Point group: C4
Chain length 334, copies 4
């Protein structure tokens, strides 16, 4: 007998159910929490990747209300340099990622000295004991430092991270656009199910959930939040924008930037997205519209009370633009 | 736990079932009702888009048993003129759309005295309080004016419209060919499920339900009605036609005409499909072949008696043309 | 509330379950019944279409053990000519189709005089009273003439046809390769479900079921039979073969023939299939192999006792050839 | 009523679940068992196809912790030689395939005295009486010769093989890359469901189950084991390699090697993928990253403890690379 735990759903398997509303899209409140002690003005944080977030993007993102995470594919000093560099740009908040393996001891130390607002312990498997123990050791050394652990996709995995002492649980095993983990390993959980399962446990402790990977459209943000996420960590959305690392590549007619997986990942190309400020404006414009459609005055309104309906592939095809030859693609329909 | 109401279906997810029939397709009674007090000879109405419905198409559709809704992005005086043109063009019935911004009753006032019959207030969210409020005022300000409210996609949504005072409930959240609302916001319900949910409530009041969007062929029209809609509204299906606004466009051997949605949508190319009279006969022809298959004498029967079956992805490929390479295309395909 | 009757399946939704076997493929018995009083050596009959079955194909098919149906898109005399022409080729059996509308009165008369072995009353809707009454009128005039009615896809539709006096019920509303009925009307039932539902009623009366339309591979034959069909009516399989009407068309590199729908249908092109004899050999070679895999000594063994399993689109993709670039396509994998 | 046993699933229908882990990928114990009395260092064996396994690939796979099965379309004397070559090539274990025609024990006799360890009788129908009979005779004629029987895809099918006297049950009816059996006959069961059904029976006898076909990546290997297979058999994954029979082929900028099935199949092109040693490290690497995710210390745990989740079509697209355009391809992708 096959040991099937359950059925699992991702973003294209569901739609948000429209409801009675006393909220205008321009009156929606996008304020939320990144950690238990850290609040964001917009529910967006950047991925800690060499092709996504350095000091330049982290500033532009923080100016819009989010938080950038400095990747760890550089020297400690350089990483510490960028944090302070971000910190001295109008009192901006900034996170910094580290490895879960021993050796990040003084890297964390310097970042704390560099005045990092939230530490991210990064791993492919947040439910591994080696990762759990690094959180415990890190928590004791800095009793009130905000720390984010991951990644997981299960309730106990979320539960295990919480007693380790995390301030927020990051959800996502496989849904990364440049990720092949689910293919190469055969292990993974469709992101919508991943969020809700972790949301079920994190809610007990009042600990925020970060949905990480898989977001491709602005409507995906609304679904991740409605699944239980406090905010979303994205890469393919910030890959392309001017502020992100890497130069623009003109290829076979159009502009591109490099977007690679930090083999589980790949090295790819992604459409240049101009200035970050417009991207967030476009992205948060869909959420606000969604919050208007579902009567969600706040993010907590959407995160806790919004309803779903399950759809087929035929339903998703109906959701997309269909049976017409597009002549002017919208900037948000890239 | 993830809050899933239920699984929702649309056109390609289902098929209708042939029953014992005493109805020949040509004899079938296609007559139905747009609103509480407005009948139609065919269950087809046109979308209030500036690339679909103005006077000519409205007149054409009305001179075939339907009704058109003149779009609203004009001068207030232009839309009244367009309405009037249809009215003097053979005493045809006509509708027109308005919004709900800080100031719209002026346009509403001008339209009624243009001889307009049914007022449409097409919104991207029919269940919003502002729309619900703007509907109550208009009904209070115009007690005998037939009012169409929408769009909604739930059972509870249609209830509000009806209790707000609408004469008809319009259904559709993100299924339109040009629509990106579901992609941009993540919000929406598959049309057929959306149709059935609103109808189930609206039938008890005796209020007609209108299917707005998602119709690609005449088969969809049949399914939309069988799910509970008293009539359907189309955009792409009527777009591109001669009577539809815009010159013909020549593009790489193929002929087209523009089609723009009213950022919640995009602009694209739709194929040129001759005079509107020719389209309707084919679309009603397929509908007639449906009623003949179902043994449905009138629209009401198909709407209330016809049964569906749920199909799979393979079942939808078996439905379309397969194996063979199309050498001589069919008018409706 | 939406009035959904049930879920319906077609050929690609299922697979036959392999079982214990004491049968070799070359020892499988393909003998079956077309009507209650007519037995076939192979469970195949041709479609009564102008691009499929005239006198030439009907002979070649009958020589292999099947029965051809002369289409009615010709004069009565010409149609009567072809039947006799087929009849005088070694005592071959032959069917002939007619319309359900009044006016086929003497066409049937001549065909009966022409010595047709089985009459087919053809209609898009076998469950229509006008069609039912033509069977009743036809049955009385020729009390023991073998008559086939259709098309239906439901149990009562099969039941209604039976009391009308049919000798066999033909199943299939929409699955035709050149058919667009399900698209244009929105009415139809996936063929696997269509057969079984009709099989449930026809079994009560010992009346054979003819599965009509949708067969694309030899494995589809086995599924139709296992669904409850006594035999299958095919068009796209006999379209292309040398014996079928129409000449060979060389187009953009390869050979073709015309295959059109008798608007509900379309006019198309289909790959030239050489001699019919080889096609049947290839087609009946898959059935025999199937009957070996499922321990089916007879067709009744497969038709009554064979099991199914439901599969996904992922399962069907696994069933096909995958993840390799075919360099030599098999004649039966056209 | 249509006789549907149950819904059956394969690799792309499911995914594995990450559990609490005290297993680093590099520490993971990949050791398993081919048969009742034959162990393997890795759970990989090669298909007995003339475009996959002869002496060189067998030696290579055996010198990496696996075993090869020399195909049978040779002279009886050639296959014995090929077996012997592997045997003297470092005392490696080796298998070989035979049929069941009117006369095969001669080949069977020649193979055993070539030093062969496990006899394979690969059939297109393991549950046929002739195969079941030919298995009983061989076990009677060779009581201590390890016998592999198959292929089957049901629970009741594996029971017969075990009761007939096989040392291992091989599973697979139509899932192979080159296989057209399911298309030609309509008969077959999706591999993962097929794996679980045979295993559920074979585990009670303590008999190993082998997964034969359907493996495209290392992730499939993990799923096949978790469903109950003690090891997997691959054809395309090892085909094309240097040690695999055939010259390299140059075709339109890309390099290949031939791959023919043994009309139940076809012939095609598979990509060139370097020395076999390089393939296995990547395929076992992904498997190691799986066990590390699942917290599985040994193959048995993954085989008996790991849980699955059922995914949809969208869930399978989220798994693969999406959105991004691949600029630098990964070895395992
Ligand atoms: O190599 C890696 N190991 C583990 N996770 C990765 C790696 N590279 C990218 N990711 C994940 O993929 C996400 C980005 O995917 P995207 O937002 O869908 O394009 C990141 O935020 C990480 O969670
Ligand atoms: O730009 C837009 N955004 C979202 N929905 C639209 C837009 N324009 C038209 N619609 C809807 O789509 C319907 C027409 O869709 P169609 O019949 O499938 O082409 C209209 O009647 C409106 O309800
Ligand atoms: O125009 C028609 N009206 C009704 N059924 C048709 C028509 N043309 C073809 N068919 C059906 O389609 C079948 C052939 O489809 P095929 O075997 O799948 O290619 C025929 O045997 C008929 O049952
Ligand atoms: O030509 C054939 N017809 C049917 N099955 C085959 C044929 N050749 C190989 N197989 C099966 O397919 C397996 C290999 O499939 P693969 O690992 O997916 O490429 C073999 O071990 C056999 O079980
Ligand atoms: K849409
Ligand atoms: K069809
Ligand atoms: K296959
Ligand atoms: K992925």
């Amino acid at each position: 007998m096959l040991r099937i735990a359950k059925e699992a759903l991702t973003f294209d398997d569901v739609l948000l159910v429209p409801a009675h509303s006393t909220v205008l899209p321009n009156t929606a409140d996008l304020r939320t929490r990144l950690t238990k002690n850290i609040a964001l003005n917009i529910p967006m944080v950047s991925a800690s990747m060499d092709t996504v977030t350095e000091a330049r993007l982290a500033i532009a993102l923080a100016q819009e209300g989010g938080i950038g995470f400095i990747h760890k594919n550089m020297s400690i000093e350089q990483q510490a340099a960028q944090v302070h560099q971000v910190k001295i740009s109008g009192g901006l908040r900034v996170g910094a990622a580290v490895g879960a393996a021993p050796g990040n001891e003084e890297r964390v130390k310097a970042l704390v000295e560099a005045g990092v607002d939230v530490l991210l312990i990064d791993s492919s498997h947040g439910h591994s004991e080696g990762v759990l123990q690094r959180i415990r050791e890190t928590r004791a050394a800095y009793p009130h430092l905000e720390i984010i652990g991951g990644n997981v996709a299960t309730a106990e995995g979320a539960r295990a991270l919480i007693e380790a002492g995390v301030s927020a649980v990051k959800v996502g095993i496989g849904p990364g656009s440049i990720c092949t983990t689910r293919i190469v390993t055969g292990v993974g959980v469709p992101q919508i199910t991943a969020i809700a399962d972790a949301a079920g446990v994190a809610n007990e402790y009042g600990i925020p959930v970060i949905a990480d990977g898989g977001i491709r459209f602005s409507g995906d943000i609304s679904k991740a939040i409605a699944a239980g996420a406090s905010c979303v960590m994205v890469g393919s959305m910030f890959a392309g924008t001017e502020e992100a690392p890497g130069e623009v590549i003109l290829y076979q007619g159009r502009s591109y930037k490099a977007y690679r997986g930090m083999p589980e990942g790949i090295e790819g190309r992604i459409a240049y997205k101009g200035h970050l400020k417009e991207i967030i404006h476009q992205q948060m414009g869909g959420l606000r519209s969604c919050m208007g459609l579902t009567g969600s005055a706040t993010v907590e309104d959407l995160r806790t009370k919004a309803q779903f309906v399950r759809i087929s592939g035929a339903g998703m095809k109906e959701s997309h633009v269909h049976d017409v030859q597009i002549t002017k693609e919208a900037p948000n329909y890239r």
